[model samples]
Every structure is written in C-alpha cells, then in structure tokens.
Target: DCHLSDMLQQLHSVNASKPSERGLVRQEEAEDPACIPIFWVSKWVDYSDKYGLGYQLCDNSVGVLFNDSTRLILYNDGDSLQYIERDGTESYLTVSSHPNSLMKKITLLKYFRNYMSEHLLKAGANITPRLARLPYLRTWFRTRSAIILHLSNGSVQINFFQDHTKLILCPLMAAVTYIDEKRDFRTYRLSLLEEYGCCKELASRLRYARTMVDKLLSSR
Candidate 1:
C-alpha cells in the first residue's frame, strides 16, 4: 500500500496536474470513455495496482528530477545527450551521442564511483601537507587552460597542455615556494627548473617570468 501511494504521488508530481481538474472521470462515466484521456487513466491505475517504482514518457525530451536521496538530470541539445547524477554533496556526469542500455549505464555509474573513490584517496594523501604549505600553488593550478573532471569523492582531475620539452611537476609539490621557503623567488625557480631537467630555451622562458615575478615578490 505504501509503495502504491508513493507511485501515485511520483506520477502526479511529474504530470503537474490534478486529476479532478484534468477531468478525470470516475468509473461511473466509463461508458463514455472517449470523454476522458483513457491512456493516462489506464497508466495511473496500472501503476497504482502494480506498485511501480517509476515510468518515463519521452518525446525527444529533457528534464530534471530529484528524489530524497539523489538528483537526476538529462539534456539533449540536438547534438548530444548528457545525464547527471548527484547526491547533495557530489555529482557524477556523462555525455554521449550513442544510446546506452540501462544495464550498461548503471555499470558505468558504479565504475565511476569506484574510480573516483580510489583517485580521491590518492589525491588527498598526495596534497595534504603540500596544499597546507603552498596555498598559491592551488591558485596557479586552477588558472591553467585545463579540462577539469569532478569526482563524487570530492576530488578533481585536471588535464592541460604543456610543451613536450617542459618537465611535468608533481601536482602536490609543484610550486617553487613549496620547494624552498627561504630562497628568493628567482633562485627557487631556477633551482626547480634545473632539478626537473629543463633545457636551455625553457630555462630562458623561466628566467623571463622569474624577473617579473621576483620583482613583484620583492615589492611585497
């Protein structure tokens, strides 16, 4: 009975219309069924009797819905389908043009949750003390032209372009300030570049920025 009640409530909420106002005829008027939209009435009765969890009607549509535990959203902009799942704290999202089977979609969702959990554990461990010490590094990292992927585990993965010749800094301990606290900005930057195997041209570029940044730091 509770399940039937919930099913009816969910169905009505989606319809956004009251049955009485929509001219829902009682069984007494069943003789003139043409006066009522039989399909909707049948669906309501069928779901209420069977205790259905939910049903969807689609006409190339897009919408968002929320339940007590999670949010569901869909978007179709004539080019692609994007769906998002979220708890209050975190979100899982995907976009694709190809149609996915329901089982496949659920499997992918589980995979993403597991993958993000593992990644966030690693990221949190990697960034703990480093993030605490060099706060500006977080700012610099965010400002890059990057594609950021947010995980349900409260971590993010950012992919960005860089010259093949440039050394990739460990994200958790990347900043010059983090490398050495006492050194001047110029010295630390040069030291970091050398330690990371930067070539002469890259060193020149680093030096060029170092002059301006060091001047600013010195002024402060």
Candidate 2:
C-alpha cells in the first residue's frame, strides 16, 4: 500500500511534468541501497495445460516477445539470457515485462503466416504454393515459439512451449511439430529469427529489461 501510494505520487509528478522519453526515470536507474545488486539465483520449469511449458529464467527475470503474430511471455532465472545466432554471435535478450506475473503464450507461425502474406512473400513469391505442403512442416512451425528471457544482470533462460497442435508453415506447406529435443529446437528457432532480423532487437530488449524491474521495486 505504501509502495502503491509512492508510485501514484511519482506517476502523477511525471505526468504533470511531462517528462521526455530520454529523461524518464527508468528502472535501471532506481536502486535500493540495502538490496543486494540484482543477481541470477536459479532456474526452474513448470508445465500446465493452460500455459504450456513455462521456465523461469531466474527469480526476477520476466518479459515479452513478438511472435510472428502476437506478444509471447518469457521468464528468466536471474540474469542468464543468452542467444547464439545463426551467425555465431552470442547475444543476450531481456523480458519486456516482469516474470512474477502470468504470461500468455502466442503462436508465432500464425503470426508469420499473416505477416509474410502481407509483407515479404506477397511481394513476389506465391507463398500459397509453399503453404500447400505446410502439414509436413508442422514440426518447424509449431516449435518456433520458444520463449527466451534475458536479464539486466546478464543471464538468460529459454522456455520451449510445445503442444500437439498442427501448425502449417507457408514457406514449407507442412505441419510442424515439436520434437523432444529442446536445445536443437531452440537453436533452430534462434537461427531462424536471426535470419529475419531480430538479433539486434533481442540484444536491446535484454539490455533494458531491468528498467521495468527497477520501476516495480521502487514503486510506492
């Protein structure tokens, strides 16, 4: 309650002042003298029929991702979010939101189908031809929504949320499925996203992820 009151005051002040984006009091700048500097503590996993496979990156790590369609939720153990792209450059990503809250799982293949049809593939390629065989590629399409959370304290955790649903990849026209092998699927998706120009965004989001945590911690 006290924290909420403080946050309300701070928010009111900020709104009244109309602070510029560059001058905002971001989370990374808020610090508690007695609190231990954020640290990567542990990693764990939970499975649910409602949320699918969920992994906590660390105690404090949490965030969001843009699947080919909607936003996907991710959790980090502490600070251990790392991604090795197809180019072999290891980059870190952060959660867009906090980990303690519930996160929604999104279907990336569905997002990609709409995105590609509207943008990339529609320019020339008859994506429909490829989409025709999507059943065979269901494994690839269905497994593409792996969630990765990167932390400000420098750690990463990945969650592979796989299900039995059949997802058709327009590029391949096959039903994509998730294999039991996790690391392989993760690396594969990371490579695929990198190919689609998400490497830098991954790095930026992870780097700034702690700002939100700091904000929550400092809230009234």
Candidate 3:
C-alpha cells in the first residue's frame, strides 16, 4: 500500500486507557484530512464455541478473542499477527515464524480468514495494515440493555436503546462517531461538542457512553 501517514503508525501500550485521559472529551481538534479516521466491524459472525469468537474489523484484521481469553489478530492479509496472551503479554510477529502455541488459534483465525473475506464483499475495508492502529477486541460484555465493545485503541463502542443507533467514543482521537436510526455515519470532535453542545439526543446517549467508558477503563 506504500502509504505515508505516520499518525496511526504510532504504537501505544496494551494498557487500557482511562476515560480521564485528555483526549476523551477533548479541547484541541485533531488535524484534518488524515488524522485518525477509522471504521469498525460492520458485519460479524459470532458463533462462539470452544474456539471462541472471531470477527474482522473494517480494516480487514481478522481477530479471535479465544476461549481462554487470549486474543490473536491476523492482518496484512494474513502476513502479520497481533497476539495478546491472557496474562497481558503481546506478540507482534509474522505468521510464518509465529510460535506453536499460537498455531491452533492461527488455524481458527484462518477459517475466519476464508469466511470473512468472502462473506464481507472481499475488499471494501482498509487493506493496508498499520500495527499501531491495529485494534484488538479488548473485551466485550452485554449489560441489561447495552452491548459494550472495548477495543485496544481506546474505542468504546456501545449499542443500546433501540438498537438502530450506535455510539462510539474514541479517546485516542478526541472524537466520537454516531450512527443514527437510519444507520447514518457522522463524526463530531468532542472538543466542539463540548463548546457548541451536541444535540439533545446525543447528549443523552453521551452520558450512558461516558458512564460505561469509565467502567470499562477502571474495570480493565
């Protein structure tokens, strides 16, 4: 892909970022045209069993948060892997030389490889892999009303209250993305949202999002 943007290439610790972090509800705006644009798993096939859950992010990274709570991701079209063992260890290595303990997961990852790449339009997502921005499913749990998805990139994606709408808080980018009942996509820099005030609908959901975000970070 021979891309030049280095922003997404900047790596961070696997440490789950706190909601108190500066960028969550920001003051400064991110740079335009090339700063931290992202997409999520638009479609998923979660048939969780002994092998665990596997899904592909919109960036085309196939990940399986294993039954043992370990996570493995196959990206760069299966050339690279981002494996996070349950005990908080991480391995970012090429698939060819990856260790044996990961082989079973890799095999399951490849099955996801075939199905996701085929089932999901084959090529609509970001093909180029950026290790820094390659997000892994940190943890997910469904509460009484909401399904919370916390990713490594400090993104807390929540789906609740009518299901048609979705909200995501990306602290790393000082931004939030909203999906309305129409499944519309809109981006709002939380900085501007603070000063100008987001719509009342968002204001309501924002509280719920912010609440769970804190819970996720601290729970981490």
Clashes of each: 0, 46, 0
In model 2, the worst 10-residue window by lDDT is 131-140
lDDT of 2 by residue, 1-220 (tens): 3332332343333233322223333322222222221222122222223322222212223222222212232232433333333233444444334233322222322232334334431111111111010000000111154433333222222233453111111111111111122211111121122223222323233222223223434541
lDDT of each: 0.25, 0.26, 0.60
lDDT (tens digit, per residue) of candidate 1 on 54-150: 2111222222222322323232232333344342443334544344543354343334334434442221122112101100001112224332222
Q: Which one wins on lDDT?
A: 3
Name model 3 segments beyond 4 Å from true. Answer: 1-36, 93-100, 117-132
Candidate 2 lDDT for residue 31: 20
- Which clashing pairs does model 1 show? none
**Candidate topping TM-score:** 3
Per-residue lDDT for 136 in model 1? 8
Assess the local accuracy of residue 56 in candidate 1 as a C-alpha lDDT between 0 and 100: 18
Q: Which is the better candidate, 1 or 3, if ranked by lDDT?
A: 3
- Determine which window of 10 residues in candidate 3 has minimal summed lDDT: 2-11
**lDDT tens readout by residue for model 3, 49-153:** 667667767766678877788988887566888878789898787789967877777888898778876775432233222235577887876677777776766
